[PDB]
Design a binder for these strands. Structure first.
Lengths: 50, 116, 75, 177, 136
RNA sequence: UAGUCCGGAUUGGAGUCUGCAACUCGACUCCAUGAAGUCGGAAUCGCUAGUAAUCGUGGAUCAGAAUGCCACGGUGAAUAC
RNA sequence: CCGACUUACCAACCCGAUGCAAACUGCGAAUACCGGAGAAUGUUAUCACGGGAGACACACGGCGGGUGCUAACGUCCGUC
RNA sequence: UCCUCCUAAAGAGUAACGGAGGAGCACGAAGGUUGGCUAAUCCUGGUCGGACAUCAGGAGGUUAGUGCAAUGGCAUAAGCCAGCUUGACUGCGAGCGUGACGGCGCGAGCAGGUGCGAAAGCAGGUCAUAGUGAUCCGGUGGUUCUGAAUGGAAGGGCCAUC
RNA sequence: UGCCUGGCGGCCGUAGCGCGGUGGUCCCACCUGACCCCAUGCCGAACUCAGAAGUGAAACGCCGUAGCGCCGAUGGUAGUGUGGGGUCUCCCCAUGCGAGAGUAGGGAACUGCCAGGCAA
RNA sequence: CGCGGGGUGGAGCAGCCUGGUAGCUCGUCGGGCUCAUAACCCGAAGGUCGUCGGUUCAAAUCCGGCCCCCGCAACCA
RNA sequence: CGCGGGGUGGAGCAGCCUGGUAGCUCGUCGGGCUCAUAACCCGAAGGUCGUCGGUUCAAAUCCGGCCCCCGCAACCA
């Protein structure tokens, strides 16, 4: 539909990523949220991916 | 009406407090006076009451109802509470904004020894 | 133009007052908030009232708005 | 502020005998004045409301409160939450200074002025008037403005009847026609 | 023709007609055509009885009709199998029970009303009577 | 170099003269107000000489009442292979 | 222009009076269902696990309804 | 196929080509929390402004609103606004609800670590109930788990995921 | 101990509205000002602080009033489980249960704990 | 009781799919050209886009209730 | 999803080639011209070259990310 799915990958070298949706036709900016990571076992930043 | 509005502001906290069933200390601020009484877990009767209405503490202040005066009763309410044995309580903002007298009152209590 | 309907959600009160339920046991599966939480009972995400601690179910009507409340006497 | 003390004594002692106030606290006092201006046509040009804001920002001594649309009206083509104008509920020291700068040097300045209406009331005691010219003020030099934009001014006092409200405003020598 | 303008739903359940009627005493007029037979009067049956009763006194008096249909009745057309839906709304009826004052009247003698209500009565399927507005 | 001291209609108020009489319906004076209109589509008119173009004056009609009609004189071209 | 006057008529909002409702409720049964305690009665009739099934076209009568025409030894469910 | 109301006979459930309407999403915020606020519709006056733009006063009372259809529900507000933030977090999960089963739903509390608040506490999405398809096969990133003589690799397994 | 008031409740329309009266020594609200903590998506209205000349209108509590809201029997009526009958598209009899509505009437509360004023 | 499409100046037709703006032919009105009409030339007026509600920054446009129009269907015994 | 190649005034295309050149056709307005529409001639307005960033004396062209579009074979969840 309108909202396609993206992949919020972590900031550290660990290959852990969260998936979510985003309205590309409303927001061209990127997503930077903070979430927990099961590998680093701390809280890091999260960059977007596809 | 100014009165009723303040009452429904206290309802949110008061309902949660009796669900927790914690010993709460209500605070009734007044343009010229201050009230604070420790209420039992049944939410029916009180255990320790202290206010500037008691002349024993009133004559020891400049004005009845200002920052240092409200802090004086804070020291007083925590003193009589530890004598009765109550250490752990929960604050009751009671519809007032935690900024002036009510704040210094609780800051005095936390400095007096009231574990909360 | 008709014929369409849905699956019955099995709502309603599961355990009636008097039964000594255990912790976690769902007491009322409702939609709105016909029944409210009292003591030892927590309002669920779907407003599904459940038992937080063991005891017997008790229905009572508190509040000035006369709403139905369910508490739990630790027995 | 100078008519504030003029009020506190001269106006107070005067009305205490007409409506026979058994107590001194039964005297009606001005509470709030509104500096409102709903231009309306800001749905076509966004800079219109800013100049409408700047005009009300010049006459008053504080920022106004830009009001939004309460609903969506298709008759005037305005949707939910759209800027319509701005208001100023000035209640303090400047409100007395605002009263002086209006009834003494702004009232007689209106082009084709003949007097105020003694009928414009709600019934509870609130007077309201509406001027078309914005040139009647001291701050406007006419060189910076470009509109013939007017507004609405309403004074709310703590009275009980409009006949008492007119009595309170009569003490402030209002040229009623 | 009596008919409720734009009601909440179009087609509605048949339902059983039980118990006694609620409208017993003559409220506005001084006379009344209280019913005994349990059944239902269509809008066409009421209007027929309305004209026959209006014409009895010709013009005078006041004539009340405390009964309104408000219960649409469906019917399947000719040459159609069962099922396939609910028939269209043809006529509106009113469920009448024993002890229900259909029509009232005032402004006429007790003699003329005994005649007026007798004529319309033969235009109804139910068995009626003739009562009077009592003392309280 | 702007609808501006361009332009002058409209309209308000005050007056003049004529003639029994100025309302329907007169010309004019005074003050104020002060619009359209920035050379005008299709189309179309007159003129070759002191004519056109442009400016002003006079007379008949007539109590009063024309930008019209008739008449006068001043300034005065271009083009006709 | 302001804008007054009026009507062989209809009708909203309120007051009093009167009815209607599966998709209305400031009220509200009888039963039914759930839990606990006690008596008597019943070859344990209850529950769990395992071997073997059949069956998964139902009919009518009573009561409660949808549908049909409060028609059909009609048709679709509840319950006996 | 899924959701809501009635039919449905006051627990649950209950059919028909019975009666009435919706969904195949949306939002980085409309989420979390802290603190504050709470109308709709009318009567009256008033610049443009007139049935309907704005402001002020009164009556009134939740008929409002609640991202969407309907029902139940909400001012302790779940309705509205603003500040700060990411709990729309990871590993679990006593004990129940609901299904033939697959499966789905609720969930106090526990450990790690986080946001907001003075603190008590609250948060593992949104007032709730639809917004969705099983397996096989294949694709993507990670983890020496294995890897058909040995050391690797391919290919599988497992985690996340299309 | 009683008259008072403020605070936290229990029970929550017999408890709440309309109207009139009344209260200020204490309590409460309004009220003066606002360089500072804080605050208005403007504004010391609200929020907060520093104080308090004065007032008891507004507000709030209390009292009377019942014009409303509300509560509410007894009896009868509707309905109905079970067992029978009939003019069995609806009712009756036996027996157990038993409304709503309306009426007489009741009815503008009651009360627990603490802390001050005041008369003793 | 059905499916698809359509309803737009006086007669009608595009534009909708991919929303902020409405075009075309004949016709109407006035002028012009001719001795006059026609034709032609010139300018202008002329469309609540069937209706109501809603969503969307913008609705003729997207959805639906309703109304009107057209073709096909009533077949085997 | 993968690959190829484009978006250019009101429209399309050339120009992108090997980086320093935005023009042609129709259209608009005015004039010249004919009796008239047209044909024809001259002059003028009309293009962030889809966009951002980078390399560079200079980029619409070269390159990368992004949006949309067209063509292509393929589609054994």
């Amino acid at each position: 539909g309108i909202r396609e799915k993206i992949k919020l990958v972590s900031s550290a070298g660990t290959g852990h990523f969260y998936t979510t949706t985003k309205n590309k036709r409303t927001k061209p900016e990127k997503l930077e949220l903070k979430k927990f990571d099961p590998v680093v076992r701390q809280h890091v930043i999260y960059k977007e991916a596809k | 009406d100014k009165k009723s509005a303040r009452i429904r502001r206290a309802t949110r906290a008061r309902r949660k407090l009796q669900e927790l069933g914690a010993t709460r200390l209500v605070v009734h601020r007044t343009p010229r006076h201050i009230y604070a009484q420790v209420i039992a877990p049944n939410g029916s009767e009180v255990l320790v009451a202290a206010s500037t209405v008691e002349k024993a503490i009133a004559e020891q202040l400049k004005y009845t109802g200002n920052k240092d005066a409200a802090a004086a009763v804070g020291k007083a309410v925590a003193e009589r509470a530890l004598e009765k044995g109550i250490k752990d309580v929960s604050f009751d903002r009671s519809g007032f904004q935690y900024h002036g007298r009510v704040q210094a009152l609780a800051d005095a209590a936390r400095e007096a020894g009231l574990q909360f | 133009r008709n014929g369409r309907d849905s699956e019955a959600k099995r709502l309603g009160v599961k355990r009636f007052g008097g039964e000594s339920v255990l912790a976690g046991s769902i007491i009322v599966r409702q939609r709105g908030t016909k029944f409210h939480a009292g003591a030892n009972v927590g309002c669920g995400r779907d407003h599904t009232l459940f038992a937080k601690a063991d005891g017997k179910v008790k229905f009572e009507v508190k509040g000035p708005k006369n709403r139905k409340f369910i508490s739990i006497e630790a027995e | 502020a100078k008519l504030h003390d003029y009020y506190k004594d001269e106006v107070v002692k005067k009305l205490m005998t007409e409506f026979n106030y058994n107590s001194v606290m039964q005297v009606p006092r001005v509470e709030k004045i509104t500096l409102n201006m709903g231009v309306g046509e800001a749905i076509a040009d966004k800079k219109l409301l800013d100049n409408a804001a700047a005009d009300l920002a010049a006459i008053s001594g504080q920022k106004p409160l830009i009001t939004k649309a309460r609903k969506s009206v298709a008759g005037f083509k305005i949707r939910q939450g759209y800027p319509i104008g701005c208001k100023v509920t000035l209640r303090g020291e400047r409100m007395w200074e605002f009263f002086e700068r209006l009834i003494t040097i702004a009232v007689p300045r209106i082009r084709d002025f003949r007097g105020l209406s003694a009928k414009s009331f709600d019934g509870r005691g609130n007077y309201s008037m509406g001027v078309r010219e914005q040139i009647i003020f001291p701050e406007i030099d006419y060189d910076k403005v470009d509109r013939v934009r007017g507004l609405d001014i309403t004074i709310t006092t703590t009275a009980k009847s409009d006949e008492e409200g007119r009595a309170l405003l009569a003490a402030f020598d209002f040229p009623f026609r | 023709m009596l008919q409720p303008k734009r009601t909440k739903f179009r087609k509605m359940h048949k339902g059983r007609n039980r118990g006694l009627a609620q409208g017993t005493d003559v409220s506005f007029g001084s006379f009344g055509l209280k019913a005994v037979g349990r059944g239902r009067l269509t809008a066409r049956q009421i209007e027929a009885a309305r004209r026959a009763m209006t014409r009895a006194v010709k013009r005078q008096g006041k004539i009340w009709i405390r009964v309104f249909p408000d219960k649409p009745i469906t019917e399947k057309p000719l040459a159609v199998r069962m099922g396939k839906g609910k028939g269209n709304v043809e006529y509106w009826v009113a469920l009448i029970q024993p002890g229900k004052v259909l029509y009232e009247m005032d402004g006429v003698p007790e003699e003329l009303a005994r005649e007026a209500f007798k004529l319309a009565a033969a235009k109804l399927p139910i068995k009626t009577t003739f009562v009077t507005k009592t003392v309280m």
